[PDB]
Amino acid sequence: YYDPETGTWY
């Protein structure tokens, strides 16, 4: 998923 604050995949 991409994080809505950082735009990184987790």
Structure's resolution in angstroms? 1.1
Q: Determine whether 10 is exposed, middle or buried from the number of CB atoms within 10 Å of its CB (0-12, 13-18, 19+).
A: exposed
User: Length of the chain, please?
Assistant: 10
Which residues, in sequence order, are CB contacts of 2 under 8 Å at separation 6+? 8, 9, 10
Q: Identify whether the C-beta of residue 8 lies closer than 8 Å to the C-beta of residue 1.
A: no
